[model samples]
Target: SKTNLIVNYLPQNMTQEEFRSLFGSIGEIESCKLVRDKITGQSLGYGFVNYIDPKDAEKAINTLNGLRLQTKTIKVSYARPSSASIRDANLYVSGLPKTMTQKELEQLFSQYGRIITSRILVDQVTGVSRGVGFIRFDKRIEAEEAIKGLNGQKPSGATEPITVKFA
Candidate 1:
């Protein structure tokens, strides 16, 4: 029975109480926490939610998966084990166009395999892309394919070739 789930793509303004208020409506929450940045105390846009009943946890997934909150659609799934075995599934990519967005990056790389998540670094204040990013694949082979296929390929209408490597 799955009692733990990871909630992703929460709006930055969402709080622990808000998370509980929503998920608790579908389940009996044992504990729910919104991950926060230590320095700024802001929501990291993800968190862990544990339920007292396994069936309720599944109900939460059925009800809340892909639910919309603000401008973001939340993703809920059974939490993967917190271990180092999946480390190789993560890759670092550099030399992206400054205009590149996380959704664009994921689309460019989706041909390789299932992308668990992707992020393009941006300025904290200006929100401009930093021309680098990370993509995590559900499988190591997909990451390898991404590195081999995308490392030196230039995007259409772009002068600079992107680089991909293990993160």
Candidate 2:
């Protein structure tokens, strides 16, 4: 194979833009995709990137492997191209008010980064907030930034403050 690296990483909490910023420096990236949920379309946290050349890929693997990208200590290595499954693994948010709507959730988290999509899970019958929700960003940096600032802190209009962690 030409390239000899595969960066398998769940970028803690970041917008995809931040992810691009972190990886783009390595080389001409063939592609970088952050997996998102199917229903709500939020980022599942982990992603894959392909480099144009084997040398660049090797360099990236050596540089980024085990390095902390934001709060996530990245896992990097060589990998062959394959279809990625965007399932399971997401941020479990807490301290949301009962009245918090999907729109409100989007507004609150968008400040940290470009929110590709955001959704609040609601009960079908009772139509109540699930007390947890999701925010998917275009880049990992925004998500990580939001986690650093919002975690353990109460945003205005929220009841119990918020805690963000990988689920």
Candidate 3:
């Protein structure tokens, strides 16, 4: 989809069909999804809409944002690109060495640029690293470089190469 827009402030009682119908009045919608609670099956007050063009997405944003639907004012805007969510600083990295410490993680990524944040996921019960991690950089290129160099790279003392990509 060339144009993807995320809608928020959805009315709690609104159904997916209703949401679709609302945007359909604006443009040709490729697809739309309403996020819902896992067990109870209730709206989460937000959803994503995919449109055929950027015009439709922007048109919908201008048309819908701050407009009340069923006593609720909705907010609409472009969805963050998956490759650069939240400043495009984040990276999803896995296949880490189980024993790799946080500093070790930082040190590995530091080869490219300044590291803003780094973490190694750990099992709560076992108190052991899960061989999975997330790290963010001061710049996007750093993240890109880390992905290019580290993905499929077998770290020392590990049997598997790590996988690195956008989170």
Candidate 4:
């Protein structure tokens, strides 16, 4: 399996190209990226560098850890496995019936597991449900169950089937 190296305390002004150049010098870089703010597009002062070979990744960590760049001593380590299920227990639900209330949504999704909370997004002006909502469960498996069972099922008073996915 390919390995991704996590780097922290990076220079805020560094770009993907710069990361590739620096990390690529040590080994064959599969990919390199600096995570950035979605709205402002500013660097989050962290990034990942993926190598095609695990040995190369290990070598990079040994060779580059604590290396200073632009007056900052960067930290380098193996990136954690990315699991969407572990990120959050919230689920996005759409095509909900306009008449559906928060209580109804909670009761409907509660069948799968213990629901932490549920809410229907409403139009502030009209005070009506926007046909979309979020349901959060205490566990990831509960959200997965709801996603599998409730997705594409048409609830009462709804003409179209609902959609469910990770929020």
Candidate 5:
């Protein structure tokens, strides 16, 4: 699930329906699962919610990163890549703003998902910005999201959208 988000540090008393209702406010959830006690009907203190829209996933993190759930604060984040999407994927980002730094490049893509690495390529001989960059994501889907959401997307100071695609 590309939009899968894990919720951590839940209070044991929270109900699955309530957990779903909480995040369900952020967006339509594809699914939400709060581990339940078979005999007691209590939650096990963590849960997962999957949003159908990738942007909705981002919204969940934005609004609920440190949200208070009952007596405890909850941590909402992209779940580690499931085995199916747990593969390295690279993106070639060219036409980047001339002044961009590797950190800025990383920040730019951070909105998409977890970034394993990001670098603004520089000329080895001249030591100048090449306006080309590379990014790697642990999960293929996130990398693909970076491309889908950012490719041909223009920057504030530029007239043209930077080119982005899989490497």
Candidate 6:
């Protein structure tokens, strides 16, 4: 029962204890992990918690799914196992600074988690942020964390935060 269950896309700025406190109420957690940025080492704003029963996992979903998690909406569902053959979830981001360069954006979000691929969409002629981009992580949960940790929370001394979405 536990083998088939997966918890992904948690709130950012949430402590490990908070995760245990909230999800722990649903069921007996065997193990938990929150993915952080590989480089900057900042919390990606999401992680996973393994439980002993599907019922407990389901309860957490029912109670927390689609709720505001650190200014971002999240969903808890069964995790899809990676195979020699499986489709991947791609993440699209927007509301970037007009002056933000590709390397700059990567540096910002990469602090959240592993980045399989990253790019900042720019106007062909103007070459500005266009306020959008794309990033792919090995895990859907990773993307979820990015959304939570980065959403609406502008960088220090910056004007505004960003908006992230799963595509």
Best-performing candidate as measured by TM-score: 1
Where in model 6 is the C-alpha error above 4 Å? Answer: 1-9, 83-167
- For residues 1-167, could you state the per-residue lDDT of candidate 5 as single tens digits? 36899888898777787888989999899898997778987777878898989899999999998987678888888788557675658888999888888888888898888786677888989999999988988788899888889999986677767998998
lDDT of 1: 0.89
- RMSD to the true structure for each prediction, in A, is 5.2, 14.0, 10.7, 12.1, 12.0, 12.9
Name the 10 consecutive residues with the lowest summed lDDT in model 2: 80-89
Query: For residues 1-167, could you state the per-residue lDDT of candidate 2 as single tens digits?
Result: 45544444465467778777777888998887766788987778667777888788778877887887656677675554342322232456876887888788778877887665566778899988877877765555666777887789877865588787654
| Full-model lDDT for every candidate | 0.89, 0.70, 0.85, 0.86, 0.84, 0.70
For this target, which candidate reaches the highest lDDT against the unseen true structure? 1
Ranking by lDDT: 1, 4, 3, 5, 6, 2
Q: For model 5, which pairs clash?
A: none
Which is superior by lDDT, 5 or 6?
5
- Report the C-alpha lDDT of model 6 over 49-160, residue by residue, as the tens digit: 7777777777877887777776767656555564532235467877777777777777777776666567778789976658788987656677777888887778545687
Off by over 4 Å in 5: 1-84
TM-score of each: 0.64, 0.45, 0.49, 0.49, 0.49, 0.47
Question: Which is the better candidate, 1 or 6, if ranked by lDDT?
Answer: 1
Error of 3 at 51 (Å): 0.2
Pick out the ten consecutive residues of candidate 3 with the lowest summed lDDT: 78-87
Per-residue lDDT tens digits of candidate 4, residues 120-141?
Answer: 8999998888999899886789
Pairing residues by index, what is the TM-score of model 5? 0.49
Model 4's lDDT to the true fold? 0.86
lDDT string for model 3 (125-145, tens) is 999999898998867887888
- The superposed Cα distance between candidate 5 and the true structure at residue 126, in angstroms, equals 2.2
